[PDB]
């Protein structure tokens, strides 16, 4: 209701307003110009002399004679409800699908509180993503943080959409049927363009995956403070759904490099000295406040799982953004440019990929008895095959021993069948079947990492069952 009209300075994104000591730090304001158009802003400095407001959007029509500022909310909040499944929002909570706005049950601050370290429990259940190179060798456990590392031209958006469309939980394996629990996907896309926006909307709506999803979409021409606020609302909704309705939610943050760049620009706008390589000194803490909101909590049935996606700047893992992500998260999944250029999709390279909670989520009564040893054997056999392939170009294929040719043929068949799956939605049984059929090319007794009981139970199948099924 009250409006302050003591504007004394306008330059770039900042404006100063005098006699405004009633505005709390971090508040949200409305800025009305002479023509009546209303913009938005955020208070970044409060003093006895004046308050400093960082303005969303541009400051074209503003002038000192007629501009006014009024308060909206002391602390930024978001109204949440279970009606939000199936809706789309713009990154500050405004719907963009043309439907009426939701009526909230509660309004929660977007900067959530940390979890008590004694309240957590160990993650011990897996998620079937439908991709063989992830389910078998780099398994995703409920409560993990597993980033995907990609590059400039690699198809990270396609893999993100495929995982969001195909992901599910498998309660029949865990408890012989157990009881069916709800599943939801929270999708946050930050700094995307129009082509990717159309692609995401079409992919989510063409197959009915929208009925269990919430989308927070932020375009590249949107204000940068919306980009800062975008993942926090997604995590607020995810935590609300998981710890107040016992949902199993999966959160996908589509590009963290855009978040880091927006953080750098916002920090430089507030006149702060940067840290290493021009990025802010508080970057580790700011990224930790986002990643560490996942996990599973003792006494609750729900869980939150995160899959951040980031693009390495020049295929450099010593860049600060991929370097600090390795200190907080549990492993990574790496895309390969060679596999992508050879025509293989999804181009996941198994050698540098790793999951650090795999052993707690597989095994007896969780996936199957033979999971771990099969994954180890596949890793070792592929590692041998690639070096043999490099040696063949010098010494020739006739100078090889008998088993080396078998390893080379295994490497070719592995890349052709296990990794390159296209748009198939393979269950874990199908992935293990293909993996066991691939290991049967190698002679029995060369499989050192697998015990003889599993070999007797599962060895000997032929790969023609998928050779004739592309």
């Amino acid at each position: 209701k009250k409006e302050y009209t003591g504007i004394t300075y306008i330059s770039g994104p900042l404006l100063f307003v005098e006699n405004a000591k009633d505005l709390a730090y971090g508040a949200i304001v409305d800025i009305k110009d002479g023509t009546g158009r209303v913009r938005g802003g955020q208070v970044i400095e409060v003093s006895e002399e004046y308050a400093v407001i960082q303005v969303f959007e541009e400051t074209t029509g503003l002038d000192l004679a007629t501009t006014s500022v009024s308060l909206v909310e002391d602390v930024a909040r978001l109204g949440v409800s279970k009606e939000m499944l199936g809706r789309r929002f713009n990154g500050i909570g405004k719907p963009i699908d043309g439907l009426p706005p939701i009526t909230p049950e509660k309004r929660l601050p977007i900067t959530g509180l940390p979890l008590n370290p004694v309240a957590r429990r160990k993650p011990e259940q897996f998620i079937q993503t439908g991709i063989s190179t992830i389910d078998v060798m780099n398994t995703l456990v409920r409560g993990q943080k597993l980033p995907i590392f990609s590059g400039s031209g690699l198809p990270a958006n396609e893999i993100a959409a495929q995982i969001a469309r195909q992901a599910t939980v498998r309660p029949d394996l865990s408890g012989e049927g157990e009881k069916e629990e709800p599943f939801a996907v929270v999708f946050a896309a930050m700094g995307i363009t129009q082509r990717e926006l159309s692609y995401f909307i079409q992919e989510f709506e063409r197959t009915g995956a929208l009925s269990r999803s919430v989308l927070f979409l932020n375009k590249a021409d949107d204000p940068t403070i919306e980009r800062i606020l975008t993942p926090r609302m997604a995590l607020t909704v995810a935590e609300y759904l998981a710890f107040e309705h016992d949902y199993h939610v999966l959160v996908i943050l589509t590009d963290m490099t855009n978040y880091c760049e927006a953080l750098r620009e916002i920090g430089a706008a507030r006149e702060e000295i940067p840290g290493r390589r021009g990025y802010p000194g508080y970057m580790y803490t700011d990224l930790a406040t986002i990643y560490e909101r996942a996990g599973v909590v003792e006494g609750k049935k729900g869980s939150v799982t995160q899959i951040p996606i980031l693009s390495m700047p020049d295929d450099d893992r010593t860049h600060p953004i991929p370097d600090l992500t390795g200190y907080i998260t549990e492993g990574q999944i790496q895309l390969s440019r060679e596999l992508h250029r050879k025509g293989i999709y999804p181009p996941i390279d198994p050698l540098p990929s790793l999951s650090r909670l795999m052993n707690n989520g597989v095994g007896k009564g969780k996936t199957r008895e033979d999971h771990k040893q099969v994954s180890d054997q596949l890793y070792s056999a592929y590692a041998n095959g690639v070096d043999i392939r490099k040696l063949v170009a010098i010494i020739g294929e006739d100078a090889l021993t008998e088993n080396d040719r078998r390893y080379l043929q295994f490497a070719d068949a592995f890349e052709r069948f296990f990794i390159n799956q296209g748009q198939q939605n393979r269950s874990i049984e199908e992935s293990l079947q293909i993996a066991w059929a691939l290991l049967s090319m190698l002679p029995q007794g060369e499989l050192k990492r697998i015990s003889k009981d599993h070999i007797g139970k599962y060895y000997g199948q032929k790969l023609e069952e998928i050779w004739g099924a592309p």
């Binding site: 006149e271 000295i273 940067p274 390589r277």
Partner: protein, 51 residues
């Protein structure tokens, strides 16, 4: 002969070049930080000429 030549010559030279380049870049970063500190100091000192 080729293996020993690589291990004893080629790798140490590349490693030394990497070390030198990293030190040069770090020095430039430090100088730019000092300049930014001076600029912020001047901005602060200008805002109190007449109160």
């Amino acid at each position: 002969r080729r293996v020993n030549a690589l291990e004893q010559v080629v790798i140490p030279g590349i490693r030394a070049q990497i070390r030198f380049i990293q030190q040069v870049l770090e020095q430039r970063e430090r100088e730019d930080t000092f300049r930014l500190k001076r600029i912020k100091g001047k901005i602060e000192a200008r805002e109190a000429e007449e109160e």
